Design a protein around this ligand. Structure first.
Ligand SMILES: Nc1nc2[nH]c(N)nc2c(=O)[nH]1
Ligand SMILES: [Ca+2]
Length: 314
DNA sequence: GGTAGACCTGGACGC
DNA sequence: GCGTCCAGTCTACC
C-alpha cells in the first residue's frame, strides 16, 4: 500500500482536491491527446507524470480534481503545490465560456463539443514543449510518446521511482547540446529528428543567447514568436504554432497538421482561396490557420484542440 | 517565391 | 509473411 503508484481509494489521507467539474476538464481527453507526452494512466482513471519538477498522480470525480504528489515524509499537497497544478491546467480560464462562444459562432463545433467537453490547453514548459514537438513532425502520437520518454530517461534528471517506473525531469538545454547526443538519440529511435534536437539545442545556446531567448518570447507577439521559432532546425509552421499555443501563451496560434486538414475539408468543406495550390503547402497551411482564427476568434488554438482531440477518437 | 520527392520508425492494412 | 500507407521539415530546382 505504501509502495507503487497511489490511488484515491488506497491512500485517502494522501490526496488533496481542487474544485473542477468534468465540464471544465477531462483528464482522459487532455493528457493523452498530443499536447504533453508525459502522462500515463498507471491505474484506471489515474494519471501519473511530472509536473513542476515533481511526480504527481491525478484522478477526478464529478466535481473534483484529486491530486497527490511524491516528493520527505509522505504528506499532502500543500496549497502552493496545488497552485502549480491549477497553473498547469490554466484553471482561471473558464472552458464553459469559451465553448459557449465557439459553439455560438460555429454550428459544427456545438455539435462536436456536446460530446467532448473538458478539452482545455496545458500551460507547458517552453523547453519540453519545443523539443517534444520537434520529435512530433511526420510522426504519430504513440511513437512520439516513446521517443520523448527515452529522451528524458537518457538525458533528464532522475526524480523518483514508483513500482518499476523511474521518472525523469525534462532534459536541460546544456544536456541536449552535449557531445554525441544526436548519435545517442538515433540509437534511441528518433530517426532524423535526432539531429534536429541536437542542432536546435546548440543553436539556442550558441546563437540565440540561450534560455532567456525562449522564455522572453512569452512577452513577444504571436507573429514575432512564431517567426523566431522557425529559425531553429526541425521547427516549421506546425511545431512553431504548437509551441506558441502550448507554451508561450499564444491562444490564437492554430497548428496545422493532417488532422486539421481533414476536419477542414470534411466538416467545413474548406478549400484554399488565396492560394493556387489545393493541397498542403506553406501557403495553403498558412491560409487554413487564418481561416480557423477568423472562424473561432482570439482562442482559436484552444477551439482547435477540442476538434483535434475528438478527431483522434476515430 | 512556389512545388517535388526524400525522409526514421513502427502499427496498420491489403494481398 | 513482404511491400505500401501514414502519422512535417528541409532541400533541390523551376
Ligand atoms: N493541429 C495539431 N497538431 C497536433 N500535433 C500534436 N502532437 N498535437 C497537436 C495539436 O494539438 N494540434
Ligand atoms: Ca503526412
Amino acid at each position: 500500500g505504501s509502495e507503487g503508484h497511489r490511488t484515491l481509494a488506497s491512500t485517502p489521507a494522501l490526496w488533496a482536491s481542487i474544485p473542477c467539474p468534468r465540464s471544465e476538464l477531462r483528464l482522459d481527453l487532455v493528457l493523452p491527446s498530443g499536447q504533453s507526452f508525459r502522462w500515463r494512466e498507471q491505474s484506471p482513471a489515474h494519471w501519473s507524470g511530472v509536473l513542476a519538477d515533481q511526480v504527481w498522480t491525478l484522478t477526478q470525480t464529478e466535481e473534483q480534481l484529486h491530486c497527490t504528489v511524491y516528493r520527505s515524509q509522505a504528506s499532502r499537497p500543500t496549497p502552493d503545490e496545488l497552485e502549480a497544478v491549477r497553473k498547469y491546467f490554466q484553471l482561471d480560464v473558464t472552458l464553459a465560456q469559451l465553448y459557449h462562444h465557439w459553439g455560438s459562432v460555429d454550428s459544427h463545433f456545438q455539435e462536436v463539443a456536446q460530446k467532448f467537453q473538458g478539452v482545455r490547453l496545458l500551460r507547458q514548459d517552453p523547453i519540453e514543449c519545443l523539443f517534444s514537438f520537434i520529435c512530433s513532425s511526420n510522426n504519430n502520437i504513440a511513437r512520439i510518446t516513446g521517443m520523448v520518454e527515452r529522451l528524458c530517461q537518457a538525458f533528464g534528471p532522475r526524480l523518483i521511482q514508483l513500482d518499476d517506473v523511474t521518472y525523469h525531469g525534462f532534459p536541460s538545454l546544456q544536456a541536449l547540446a552535449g557531445p554525441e547526443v544526436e548519435a545517442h538519440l538515433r540509437k534511441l529511435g528518433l530517426g532524423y529528428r535526432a539531429r534536429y534536437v541536437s542542432a536546435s539545442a546548440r543553436a539556442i545556446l550558441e546563437e540565440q543567447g540561450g534560455l532567456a531567448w525562449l522564455q522572453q518570447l512569452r512577452e513577444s507577439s504571436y507573429e514575432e514568436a512564431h517567426k523566431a521559432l522557425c529559425i531553429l532546425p526541425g521547427v516549421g509552421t506546425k511545431v512553431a504554432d504548437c509551441i506558441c499555443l502550448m507554451a508561450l501563451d499564444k491562444p490564437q496560434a492554430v497548428p496545422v497538421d493532417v488532422h486539421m486538414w481533414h476536419i477542414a475539408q470534411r466538416d467545413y468543406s474548406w478549400h484554399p482561396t488565396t492560394s493556387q495550390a489545393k493541397g498542403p503547402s506553406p501557403q495553403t497551411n498558412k491560409e487554413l490557420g487564418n481561416f480557423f482564427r477568423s472562424l473561432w476568434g482570439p482562442y482559436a488554438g484552444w477551439a482547435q484542440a477540442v476538434l483535434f482531440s475528438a478527431d483522434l477518437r476515430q
